[PDB]
Design a protein around this ligand. Structure first.
Ligand SMILES: [Cl-]
Ligand SMILES: [Cl-]
Ligand SMILES: [Cl-]
Ligand SMILES: [Cl-]
Lengths: 161, 158, 161, 158, 161, 158, 161, 158
């Protein structure tokens, strides 16, 4: 059970957001690694991580960062793997800086970007699951089950109290 | 048979989404390029998304502007990876497009790319990266593309 | 007393906002239904709800959603009834994403959009009431009374304490 | 006799609001199209809004740009449904227009449509949807409009 | 001592902000009235207030409002007096809607706009004082004294604790 | 002798501030129209503001773009009412101009007008409203201006 | 040990942010002064401070301000020294007004601008240190040590609890 | 031998960054002007930044648009002062450029200048101010530049 998804983030504070991606991959039984890699404080670690990801058997990278969020884009610069980016909510600008720093990649090097915050982290895991489900029928079935339960769990009317 | 579907809300969107179409062709990825409007052809959208997987599609690239609902509603109906391209709007220059695509609630993802032509090109490349996981010949072509992209950058401005 | 307005929202969390529309329709004695319909998690429910609304006797739909708020627009895609949209305030972007996702409908499919949050929900009910009052003299009188009391309730000067 | 009033703050606004005028005509909805400035003709505005219902108007469509006060002040004076169209401003591209119209406090509503020509067209359609509740012939024409809009969308970009 | 400045606001909730203008005019000994006038709920009151302001001896109007803030602009539509506008901070959009709704008046009808919130209210009073000081030497002296004390009150270095 | 000073940071600002100049002339208000740069001529600015009152100026209208510091720094040095006009900037379309002028901390006010030509025209009118408090002939001309502005608004778009 | 960096700010409230610059210069053993200078309330103090800075032996000025933040720009107008600007987070607009007021200096008079808030203050000190390290080998060594420790302090994986 | 390096992500960026190049030349500061793409030539970037100090560079000026990562990634690899110029982007007019450069977390600074040509010119001037600390001849030329800039401002608009 070698990892097929890598979850990386710039700092421990990012884990409050990125833990939601970690949890969801575990629930879908997707082998993964969850690591801290700082674009700005460990740039050589980042370069090494990204340029060896494919040969290590990783299939998808989920990268989370806030503020001037460069981790997902610089990861994608160094790997042909799909890289998904999660904008971590920032204090002053509430993730608008995080979002624009990740999604506005110029043509040539993509980052598939999800919503600001916890929703984006969960959706990055689900998008990674969708990608892997293309080749893995068991996982495809688990993902379709997840989506069916999601749909069946929506009540018909709200609770008033 | 197409493995990527490129869909967009209107003819005018094609000025942007043609960059995705061109890139898929350059990488020799079989694809279909179609107009599907979330707001004006919602039943067409529902049928398209619902049947995508059984038709053999692997990735959907969806472009729209303004209150851009096409990628999110497509993802609501398929388990396939859906990639969203915010088309530049007249007034708000794609900021409305961008927020209405990227800010999907948890449970139904859309992988969102940059506003405009860059995003369309990158959606095609991201689709290619996804398909390359399973297809060694395509993976080689994608690596060639990235190598040429890197090698072609000049060292000084003219 | 079959419903003539439908209030729909994507989630239970939306009801904290949309309850203000519910309450106001009740105070104006407008028969209505209040339901959860998720654009993203129950898309078939949404399609069915919208395309049968008119034949069921509904006259106005009030739809609330937050973030990438697609519920009001997709409702309007499937019905000729007037659809009013309430942007629910979002955590990071404070409803700016909700607002733009609802109001910026391209030409052909309208959503009449109200303010972000509780004010917008109350005003959606009042706008629905204004629409229905065009054909219902009793309700027209109740609405004019509401507006008169509103005006008469404004004091001449503020309280200092 | 008009059942919809289209009003706008200035002649230049008509480049936008003419799309509402055209649509009402296409659907054969009797209407009046007028200039009423909140800031420059406030008494004209007060009289217009105050007398709208007794004149037989059912819906008011109001377009304005910048610090756009026309729709809100109109709604302050009438119990009729008032629909607001943010006109694209030079500097802020209608973001000022949009916020000054949509963010009405509770008690006095304005149903707000998109910035620019799309919003003007949609205000007319929303007015038509309102009037169709009571008018079977108009409801049929509106359903025809929506059916043609849906059916006319091509399947592939040229 | 008839009022020479009128402070008006849309609601009691606005007074938390506008009280700072009230207090400052009192400290500068400027006779004033402080009233609630709602653009949207008391439009006839507003029209009457603005169109009689000059003949009543008012010289400056300070108007505060939030959200779709129409009070200052509609006041200025009806009076030749200088009208100063204070954007009241709003819940979702933090006064950005208030600010744009007030400052972006088209050419022909001005509103002199101050900062969002308490700072803007204090500055509206000071700007009104500056206007009145043009014709009132006593007040000019009080205002120059205020500004001198303000300047003299700035310490040379911060306190660390 | 001038009773209003119009100042601006650069020649290019005059494309905007000329509208203030024209309006003051139309209302026959004696004024001076000058270039004063906060960033490039800070000593010129300090002397201008410091001496304004003793020179007989009653109002200063200051226009600037980008990180627009001219109105605020002028108000720092004079007790005269200072009115600020955000000049439209190339990239951010005057949003930077607007925030850097209007968001003055308490203690030193700048009465801020709209971004661009509208704001320049309105700064002149606001200056006129201030001066009309003391000058009956000017008050009459201003009332004539407002009456003509109101009366000139057409009733229907062409 | 005469100061070679001046840290200035408009108010005591700014020190909650600017103290981070003060602390960092002390830790890097860079002699500095930390002062309050208000652009709007002490404009003559500001002019004098900036135009004498170079002759006093200062090499870098770090200036912090919020809202309509004019202190860094007006400082740079009066000195040829490099001036670094720190946008202090504002209440309503969360430092967006601070940021734009500082960074958008027209061509001719630069302000090197750092992030909104505490991060920007720490980085202003580090940027000042980088500038001074060009001529000071001891400080260059201390700065390289700071950066090495920073890098070595990043863990490989997050803590889950 | 260059003491300032001007780098930018692409040829199109040079329309902006040429203003920095021109200014350094005007002040006779030896420099190199190069294309280095964070996203397309990340190894070129790493080598450039890592070796900058030992090559004798004192300041790096880096310009980029969109998700602008070039200045921050450069600062990650060098202890030299790095100055960042947000290049105006097509859709968001450099607001994305600006936020992705200025909002660096604590520990790795980038001194950020205005969006566009103004920022490029100011990055060169800020680099000059830094170098003038150590170089009396350059300090004199910079003071001459600032004196001419101040003295050249006209007193009235034409
Ligand atoms: Cl089409
Ligand atoms: Cl007109
Ligand atoms: Cl000039
Ligand atoms: Cl290139």
């Amino acid at each position: 059970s070698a990892p097929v998804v890598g979850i990386i983030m710039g700092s421990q504070s990012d884990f409050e957001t990125m833990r939601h991606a970690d949890a969801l991959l575990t629930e879908l039984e997707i082998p993964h690694e969850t690591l801290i890699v700082s674009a700005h404080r460990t740039p050589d670690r980042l370069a090494d991580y990204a340029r060896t990801a494919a040969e290590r058997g990783l299939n998808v990278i989920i990268a989370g960062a806030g503020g001037a969020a460069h981790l997902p884009g610089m990861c994608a610069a160094w790997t042909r793997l799909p890289v998904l980016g999660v904008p971590v909510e920032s204090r002053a600008l509430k993730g608008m800086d995080s979002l624009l720093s990740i999604v506005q990649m110029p043509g040539g090097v993509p980052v598939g970007t999800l919503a600001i915050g916890a929703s984006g982290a969960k959706n990055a895991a689900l998008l990674a699951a969708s990608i892997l489900a293309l080749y893995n029928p068991a996982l495809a079935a688990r993902l379709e089950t997840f989506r069916a339960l999601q749909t069946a769990s929506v009540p018909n009317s709200p609770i008033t109290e």
